[PDB]
C-alpha cells in the first residue's frame, strides 16, 4: 500500500498540536483502517493536512460525548466533509511523512 502522501502540513514538527477544530457536514465511513469514520455533526480536531498526491485528505481525531474527550486514534478523512470552525495554530510546518503516519492506530 503506497503512502497516501510524501509530505504533510502540521502546526509543529511533531504534529502534536491541533491545527483546527471542524464540524462534519457529511457522513464518511472509513474504507480501511487508515481512515476515520465520521457522521454529520461530529467534531473533528485536525492535526495534519496531507500534500501532493494525498491533498484531499486531512488527519485527525473525533471528539467524544463528554466535554474534553478526544479519541486517541488518529486517522485520515476527506477535507471536504468538514467545515473548519476555529484555526487553532497555522498549519504551515512542511514535514516529510514517516512510516508511523500510515500505520493503523
Numbering used by the authors: 3 to 107
What is written in the article reporting this PDB entry?
Melanoma inhibitory activity (MIA), an extracellular 11 kDa protein highly expressed and secreted by melanoma cells after their malignant transformation, is known to play a key role in melanoma development, progression, and tumour cell invasion. Structural analysis revealed that MIA is a single domain protein that adopts an Src Homology 3 (SH3) domain-like fold with N- and C-terminal extensions. However, unlike classical SH3 domains, MIA does not bind proline-rich peptide ligands. After its secretion, MIA directly interacts with extracellular matrix molecules, such as laminin, fibronectin, and tenascin; it thereby masks the binding site of cell adhesion receptors, e.g. integrin, to these extracellular matrix components.
To elucidate the binding mode of all confirmed fragment hits, we soaked crystals of apo MIA with the individual fragments and determined the resulting structures by X-ray crystallography. As fragment soaking always led to a loss of crystal order, structural elucidation was only possible for protein crystals cross-linked with glutaraldehyde. Only for fragment 11 (pyrimidin-2-amine) we were able to obtain a complex with MIA in the protein crystals. The structure of fragment 11 bound to MIA was solved at a resolution of 1.39 Å in a primitive orthorhombic space group (P212121). The electron density unambiguously identifies the binding mode of fragment 11 that sits deeply within the hydrophobic cavity formed by L76, G77, and Y78. The binding involves a sandwich arrangement of the ring system of Y78 and the side chain of L76, consistent with the high- and low-field shift pattern of ligand induced chemical shift perturbations observed in 2D 1H-15N HSQC NMR spectra of MIA. The pyrimidine ring is stabilized by the hydrophobic residues L76, G77, and Y78 at the deepest part of the binding cleft. In addition to these hydrophobic packing interactions, the polar amino group of fragment 11 is orientated to C-terminal residues of MIA and forms a specific hydrogen bond with the backbone carbonyl oxygen of W102. Moreover, the pyrimidine nitrogen atoms N1 and N2 are involved in water-mediated hydrogen bonds with both the side chain of D103 and the main chain of R36, respectively. As such, fragment 11 occupies the position of a water molecule in the ligand-free structure that is displaced upon binding.
